[PDB]
Amino acid sequence: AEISPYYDSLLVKLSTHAISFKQAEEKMVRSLREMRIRGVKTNIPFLINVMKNKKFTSGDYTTKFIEETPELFDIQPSLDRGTKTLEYIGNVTINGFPNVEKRPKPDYELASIPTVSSSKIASFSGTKQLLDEVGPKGVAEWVKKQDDVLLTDTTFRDAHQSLLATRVRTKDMINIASKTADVFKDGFSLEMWGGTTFDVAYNFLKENPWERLERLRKAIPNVLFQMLLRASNAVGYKNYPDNVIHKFVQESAKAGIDVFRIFDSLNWVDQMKVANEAVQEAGKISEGTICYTGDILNPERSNIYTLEYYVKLAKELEREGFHILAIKDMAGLLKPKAAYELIGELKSAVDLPIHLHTHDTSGNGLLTYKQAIDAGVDIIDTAVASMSGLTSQPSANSLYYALNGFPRHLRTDIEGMESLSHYWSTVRTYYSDFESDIKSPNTEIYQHEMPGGQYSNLSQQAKSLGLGERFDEVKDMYRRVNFLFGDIVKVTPSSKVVGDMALYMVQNDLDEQSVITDGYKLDFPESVVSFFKGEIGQPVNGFNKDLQAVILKGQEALTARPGEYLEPVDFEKVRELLEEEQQGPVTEQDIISYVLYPKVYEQYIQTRNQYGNLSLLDTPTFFFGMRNGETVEIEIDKGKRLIIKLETISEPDENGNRTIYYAMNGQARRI
């Protein structure tokens, strides 16, 4: 209807009739409740409260009934959520999705989603309950006693971070939470937070990672939740003051995180204290991480990263009060014998349980695990078969059977694992646009040492310039830049630093010797100057004084750790800003999420305002929208689902606007 200001506006004349006044009034309320007019602000909510007011139901009312009622005026916008969803689906159906090849919504197979009742899972007592009963120290003492190999699943985090650009949505995780609870009832922990997930969830997927955490917490109350936590910046992208690290750990622990794997990108123990202390305070599990580089088997490979280096480092982190020692083999460089020899040595060295994490990029991951298990490793990170291998972790499914006939067994449920694999095998299909180009094992990692993703990211990037042909030199320069920088540990961001130089040098045709000679006029990349400024911490070997001078160009390098130089964040200001921007009341999660990712968070609130809660849509619909004649269901609660049918899309009108003919909840609608 077109409503004009020229007449006495009257939409509906509503009249009720019953035997009693009480009943006639209740019918009126019901009718007004059933009324829903969108597009223009009506008078219904006023009429509702007028009838609802008790001073009316008794009768005996005056003409000053409106004047003498304060509670009659109320601020309630009635957020039209369904329209917002119809608009999102409308937009993606017409204009597409970021980094998704614009094509008709693809055919997918039925993913049979196995289920375990919530009352059965409530009866389970796994490692979450253990922590509640014996504390962080008690858990570590218990891990040490177990003869079996305990496992940590990475399917919810590092597996899809490696294989699917961290694009796996909450919805696909939530659907198998109750099965996962059962399958991994005896697992040590489920890695499901940290890494790139926080950032990616908010920015690319436009969904709240805290809700992922909180919704998985409820659904899986029995297993320890684990996250990756970088020592310098937790989960962020720059440097932050100490109170920011502390606030994030406080909030994460409340929300349900139990094991924090704390690592530093240069194995610098000083930069791990603040995170450690925060976790200790939270009463949770603090995993002191040793990142692995070089090759302890080859004595010609490093005069620095030898076996005793890692022992002294383990011995140090134990003195720091970490509950569990973790080995993070980020580039999958821990060769089988090296694993055996290393874990074997560290077990004599320290009294902490060892938690080993590797990547299968060389294709020797399972062997590494097998070997570590012989040496007496306590916990290992694995993935469900369909989300395992190559740049991911070794297949738990494969390992389970691999140990048949050997002394130590993998404590887990294979039937369950097979079932999970089949689930994820079908789901992975929804994410084919984000499949890595790595499809076979690469042993050149043993020379260049490029961790996790890099090797593909830095291949696209080498092409995005003019070096796409001569990637041979990049691979070489990468290895030389490493040694030029004094042989460093390479993970984020230290890995980007080395990466960026390899490109730069090849690009401008730089030698090792001519990087000093011409350096006075070179203008190095921002991540490089940052590194020689100490902005990501101190390398083991330190800085070559001359190279540092040539790169910094007069600038001062930090002496202490980056965090010390930083002004503490006034979280009140942050609250005062975010409350102005939004409707009103704001949570602590909001506050800390803003501090870590100001712009990203801001953009997320902008999308939430526009399209509502996108996390509830199913992945195919999220990425592709709907085809003509399709019916889509969106689950909210038990029997609280939005039923959306797409009939047709019109031709674009004079303004290029397409009219979409919908049918939502039986009601016909036009977007």
């Binding site: 019953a18 035997i19 009693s20 009480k22 009943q23 209740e26 019918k27 309320v29 019901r30 409740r33 019916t631 609660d637 038990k638 029997g639 609280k640 689902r641 039923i643 049918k645 049918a663 909840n665 039986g666 009601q667 016909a668």
Partner: protein
């Protein structure tokens, strides 16, 4: 004392129940089948669940065990059967009460006593009502409501005489032509039976009138389709009252506001028509297809308890 309600039915009757229950500030629950994936009654309730994902769309509504499984897994403490499915089913009510769920209707022995053709006649002889032979008959039935507190009233008769073969077509309330004291002797005879066996909740006593005499035919132990017609002339809401009797409320109480026996009278006349998909071109047989155009009325006097026909 009812928090939330489930309707074991579909279509117009379900929507009528949801509206009544929501008026009593009671949460509503609806069930559907494979072919009723987009029936109107699915959306008009607070909660909607699929019954029998494997069983057929016709059998799905008549599955005693599975409907209980939904009610249990939803904290439902009351189920309204509606009409013409499990409304006259004895073991449904037994099973409901076994799972602590209030069956909205008469008690176990009432359906048992009126379900069989023979037993729903043995009771009438025990309460003084005729049977054995007929020519030029006038189909009249009386509406009866009684609570759990021993108070039973009537809401006058319905003239269900306009009918084809095994199908009612047009109803009239109240009945026309019949003398003031003839309809009295019908209604009194209707109460004669229902007060005799301590009848609870809504119910109907079917009579056959020839010349100047009552004749007991059967008892419908629930709400009928033609119930609306009586509500309009009496003023009293039948479906609403049904739910209120399930909570254990007195008839003439502050919650039902039911008038006394000599306070209940008819206002004007009322006529009902059912809008099906039957026609004399296919001799009253249904058709399949999308309802391209739906044009409805409304206004004064016209009452619309819809449910099935809409946008397309």
């Amino acid at each position: 004392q009812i928090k939330k309600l489930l309707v074991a039915n579909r279509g117009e009757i379900a929507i009528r129940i949801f509206r009544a229950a929501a008026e009593l500030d009671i949460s509503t629950v609806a069930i559907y089948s494979n072919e009723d994936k987009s029936s109107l009654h699915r959306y008009k309730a607070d909660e909607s669940y699929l019954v029998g994902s494997d069983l057929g769309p016709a059998e799905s509504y008549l599955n005693i065990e599975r409907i209980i499984d939904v009610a249990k897994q939803a904290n439902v403490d009351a189920i309204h059967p509606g009409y013409g499915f499990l409304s006259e089913n004895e073991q449904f009510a037994r099973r409901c009460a076994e799972e602590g769920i209030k069956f909205i209707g008469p008690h176990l022995e009432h359906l048992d006593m009126f379900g069989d053709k023979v037993k729903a006649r043995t009771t009438a002889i025990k309460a003084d009502l005729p049977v054995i032979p007929i020519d030029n008959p006038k189909h009249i039935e009386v509406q009866v409501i009684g609570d759990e507190h021993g108070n039973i009233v009537h809401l006058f008769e319905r003239d269900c005489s306009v009918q084809r073969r095994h199908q009612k077509v047009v109803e009239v309330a109240p009945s026309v032509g019949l003398s003031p004291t003839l309809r009295q002797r019908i209604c009194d005879a209707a109460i004669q039976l229902m007060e005799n066996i301590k009848y609870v909740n809504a119910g109907t006593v079917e009579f056959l009138v020839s010349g100047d005499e009552f004749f007991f035919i059967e008892v419908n132990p629930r709400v009928q389709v033609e119930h609306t017609i009586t509500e309009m002339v009496t003023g009293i809401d039948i479906v609403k009252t049904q739910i209120l009797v399930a909570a254990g409320a007195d008839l003439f109480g502050e919650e039902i506001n039911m008038p006394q026996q000599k306070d209940i009278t008819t206002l004007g006349y009322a006529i009902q028509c059912r809008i099906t998909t039957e026609d004399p071109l296919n001799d009253f047989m249904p058709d399949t297809g999308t309802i391209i155009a739906y044009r409805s009325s409304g206004g004064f006097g016209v009452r619309l308890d819809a449910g099935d026909g809409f946008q397309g």
